[PDB]
Write a protein that binds this ligand. Sequence first.
Ligand SMILES: CCCCCCCCCCCCCCCCCC(=O)OC[C@H](COP(=O)(O)OCCN)OC(=O)CCCCCCCCCCCCCCCCC
Ligand SMILES: CCCCCCCCCCCCCCCCCC(=O)OC[C@H](COP(=O)(O)OCCN)OC(=O)CCCCCCCCCCCCCCCCC
Ligand SMILES: CCCCCCCCCCCCCCCCCC(=O)OC[C@H](COP(=O)(O)OCCN)OC(=O)CCCCCCCCCCCCCCCCC
Ligand SMILES: CCCCCCCCCCCCCCCCCC(=O)OC[C@H](COP(=O)(O)OCCN)OC(=O)CCCCCCCCCCCCCCCCC
Ligand SMILES: CCCCCCCCCCCCCCCCCCCC
Ligand SMILES: CCCCCCCCCCCCCCCCCCCC
Ligand SMILES: CCCCCCCCCCCCCCCCCCCC
Lengths: 101, 100, 480, 162, 55
Amino acid sequence: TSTEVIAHHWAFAIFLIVAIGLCCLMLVGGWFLGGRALSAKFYLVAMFFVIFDVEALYLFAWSTSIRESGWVGFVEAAIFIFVLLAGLVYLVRIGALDWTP
Amino acid sequence: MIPLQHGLILAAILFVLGLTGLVIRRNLLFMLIGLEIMINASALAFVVAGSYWGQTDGQVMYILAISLAAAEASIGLALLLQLHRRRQNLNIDSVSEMRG
Amino acid sequence: MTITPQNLIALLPLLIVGLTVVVVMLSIAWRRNHFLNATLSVIGLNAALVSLWFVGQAGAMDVTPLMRVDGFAMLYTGLVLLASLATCTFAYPWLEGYNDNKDEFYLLVLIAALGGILLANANHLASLFLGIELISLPLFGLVGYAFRQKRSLEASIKYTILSAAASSFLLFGMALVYAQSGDLSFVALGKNLGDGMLNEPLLLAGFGLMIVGLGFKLSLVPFHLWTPDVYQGAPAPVSTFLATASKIAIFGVVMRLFLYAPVGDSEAIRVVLAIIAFASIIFGNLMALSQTNIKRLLGYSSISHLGYLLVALIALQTGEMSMEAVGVYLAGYLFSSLGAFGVVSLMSSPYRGPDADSLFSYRGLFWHRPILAAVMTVMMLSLAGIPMTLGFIGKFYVLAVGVQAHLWWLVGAVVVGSAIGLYYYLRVAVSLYLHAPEQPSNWQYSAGGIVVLISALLVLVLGVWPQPLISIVRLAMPLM
Amino acid sequence: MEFAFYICGLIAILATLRVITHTNPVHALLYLIISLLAISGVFFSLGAYFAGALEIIVYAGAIMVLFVFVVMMLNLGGSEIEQERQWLKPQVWIGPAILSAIMLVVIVYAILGVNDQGIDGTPISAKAVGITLFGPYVLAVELASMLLLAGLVVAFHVGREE
Amino acid sequence: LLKRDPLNSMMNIPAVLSRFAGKGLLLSENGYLRWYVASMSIGAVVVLALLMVLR
Ligand SMILES: CCCCCCCCCCCCCCCCCC(=O)OC[C@H](COP(=O)(O)OCCN)OC(=O)CCCCCCCCCCCCCCCCC
Ligand SMILES: CCCCCCCCCCCCCCCCCC(=O)OC[C@H](COP(=O)(O)OCCN)OC(=O)CCCCCCCCCCCCCCCCC
Ligand SMILES: CCCCCCCCCCCCCCCCCC(=O)OC[C@H](COP(=O)(O)OCCN)OC(=O)CCCCCCCCCCCCCCCCC
Ligand SMILES: CCCCCCCCCCCCCCCCCC(=O)OC[C@H](COP(=O)(O)OCCN)OC(=O)CCCCCCCCCCCCCCCCC
Ligand SMILES: CCCCCCCCCCCCCCCCCCCC
Ligand SMILES: CCCCCCCCCCCCCCCCCCCC
Ligand SMILES: CCCCCCCCCCCCCCCCCCCC
């Protein structure tokens, strides 16, 4: 409820509103003005991205509290990263990540 | 100053709408979409419950929920691609050879 | 709380199975070898059994806020590991007939066994949900392993869509329970209630949606319709695993949840589970009556047998031997289903391709497979609850549990469903010995035959002499 | 923080209602992305900042991308279901709509009557979620890694082309 | 009048009812996934309504 916090909230709201309005108004002006007269490897890559992004979010949560988690948290994240790297090595070696076989 | 009942009711509304979409839609892709709506509503309910009690367990439940949602979405879309490649048809009623 | 070295030695089957998953994956990445990767998976599962011995040498304690290891956990972990080992043994000749990659099968079997172990040790809604999902997703892969075959792809799609819906139901019910009760541990689901206010509407509704998810997973009526389709369409070792390990692990975590939760002795939940048990017994036995397909028949059979187990669960808060009955019945059901689905797997192995039919054709099996016919008729007698078989010992335990708790409708349901089971089981067992007009050579097929023969001998011997099994299940006591 | 919650919840409800009754897959996925943005706004209104961040990052930013990838790869141009439009026929949707409405009334009746002092909205940071995640939920993290591994192996085995 | 055993017939009618009820219950196994989802949601409605009624 600080005045700095509410001022920054208002500034963020005005930033988003004015930015989206600027883009929309620029397209509106562009439209109104002026006269008139597949392979499955894409799925594989996107699916690998989704899986590795969820494992990335796990590491995202770990990274902000490494000191509070101590060495036992380091050991757990090391097991997590080793399993993730084993899966990555598996995908590379079986040709799943090889774009040109 | 938001009641827990309102967040839970919103999650129930989203769960019901996702289940309706899962039942009434004959396309397999829209069934998968309704499944995502259902599991996202469940994760929203867990977040509302955790934020009422002031505990981090609701967001951890959300994290496990979206890990399941990601993995089951990938599996379902792989099965959808296999069905389209085998039959050139996304009809969930046509894949019904096994019956009592 | 943290993880001590004592917590590490209690965690040993989970750690060994996870390390086996990593090692098998790295061996797959190094070179695609069927024999060595199957060997590594079965070595990891046997090492997990010996790890269960080492866990038994340690004490019973809570390894996490999430896990609790006791004799209950050791018993159901051992059941899951035995089912996984038998699935790998049955899977090798069937995969030898396969043409595509045949080691991701073993990776998925190991991950599903890891989920089974987690469900055996699950003391939390977190570990319950995660164990259910870790059972389910590798089974999505395994059920549609032969996706080029039409029936396997159809069973995969059905199981995937319905299990995603059931996991959504279970997760929403968990969220409602957590909304009512501020803790997610099993012991705390209903602690903040008193003076006869156990029937909180939100706690009951959350437990009902969890009942929807768990009753999908246990093939309980009215969440049972997927069972014959997924059982028939899946590969036969996958049918073995889905019949044994998934149901055993999920029903064990349902045991621990209803034993620990203070709302587990609610009258409304007891009546709803009694209705589901009655309907499951009657409906599964009635629906297996006119089945010419062996796998659909075993699916409806699983529906009825899980109804009997649910009857044993209903008396958990009234009698005392409910956990004992569930353990004995689950050991007997495990060995019976292992034998029956193993005969079905051995006669469907090697794989004949996605185009060729995979019909069992059990009529006249004795004239070319006499030992397999004897094993299958021992299983058919055991699943019928015939005395001299372990299935009768389980049925006797269920009947004693129901009689103690005065569950007369459930006892009559068991009697009626048992008579209907006698009809269709004896139909199969005597069709084994008739005459049919018309319609191996490696040690892994012989190993599968050894597995089903040892299952037959176990069923017969423990039906005649059930005292060692009763003594084993009695000392596998959970925390009171 | 109450106004934000109510408008975002209303936007989410309207968006999924337009998701389940739409015919074009890309339009349905777009309304689904809008619903996920609104639900992340609901998360931010309640103080679950990490949850809203992951809702945009992962759910609306990875999984919906996979859905859009699949839709543009299969090239749905009205394969006999757009021209049929069976889900908007009353005889098809009236049954499940009453069934879902009954389930909604039962669940909502269960929701009401529960004691409720209100959601405070105090922010639960990603710091505390990370502390819980690698503290009392270590096995959840490792077995969730194995779960995502299983999903990876299954989706590779099924979804590859050859 | 009794040459075709009447007591045997009135004791065999439970088998007839069993076959009829099994054939009737096998109509639910139509093999349609959308009906399976509908049946799960119907069972969810029934279980929730039973829990609210019984309390
Ligand atoms: C023979 C008849 C048929 C039996 C079928 C059984 C099927 C399930 C197989 C696994 C069952 C494991 C059950 C373990 C229950 C243990 C309960 C318990 O508390 O045991 C305690 C005991 C040590 O005693 P205590 O001094 O109390 O220790 C605690 C002191 N801090 O600790 C122990 O006793 C340790 C127990 C170790 C068990 C190791 C099992 C290895 C695998 C055996 C497989 C047998 C073959 C079955 C299948 C054949 C092929 C189909
Ligand atoms: C289709 C075939 C199967 C049919 C269904 C299964 C059997 C159904 C039997 C129904 C019994 C109804 C009992 C009604 C009262 C129950 C509550 C009660 O007060 O019970 C009395 C008593 C428990 O009270 P308590 O203080 O412990 O007294 C002990 C001394 N009696 O109770 C006891 O101590 C125990 C009571 C035992 C009751 C009888 C159990 C055996 C039944 C034999 C077979 C069924 C009847 C005959 C066949 C009918 C046609 C098939
Ligand atoms: C006097 C009253 C008091 C005493 C009651 C005592 C009850 C227990 C002892 C009596 C049990 C009577 C059972 C009667 C039916 C026997 C089974 C039978 O007839 O099987 C043969 C028949 C197959 O022959 P078919 O007709 O050619 O086959 C058509 C399908 N292909 O099979 C079929 O057609 C299908 C068979 C279905 C499964 C068997 C029937 C189960 C019925 C319920 C059993 C429990 C009954 C409880 C009491 C009921 C009322 C008396
Ligand atoms: C106006 C009528 C409708 C017009 C069309 C729709 C436009 C978008 C409407 C919804 C989004 C904006 C809602 C209004 C938010 C205004 C800011 C606000 O309420 O801030 C309060 C709170 C600040 O945080 P806190 O510190 O807790 O505040 C208490 C004081 N310390 O804030 C918070 O805690 C979090 C604030 C919300 C989260 C950020 C915004 C999320 C936006 C989601 C957009 C979804 C897609 C919209 C599509 C629109 C077109 C269909
Ligand atoms: C606070 C200082 C601690 C120093 C010692 C740290 C190392 C000892 C404790 C290690 C605990 C490791 C727990 C790992 C669990 C992995 C579970 C995997 C399941 C598949
Ligand atoms: C102790 C086990 C009891 C149940 C199993 C029964 C099977 C025993 C071993 C096989 C017996 C085969 C008998 C076949 C007889 C065929 C006769 C045909 C010509 C009349
Ligand atoms: C379609 C198959 C139907 C099978 C029905 C089986 C029914 C068995 C008989 C049940 C009898 C229950 C008697 C209960 C008496 C309770 C008395 C309580 C006194 C306080």
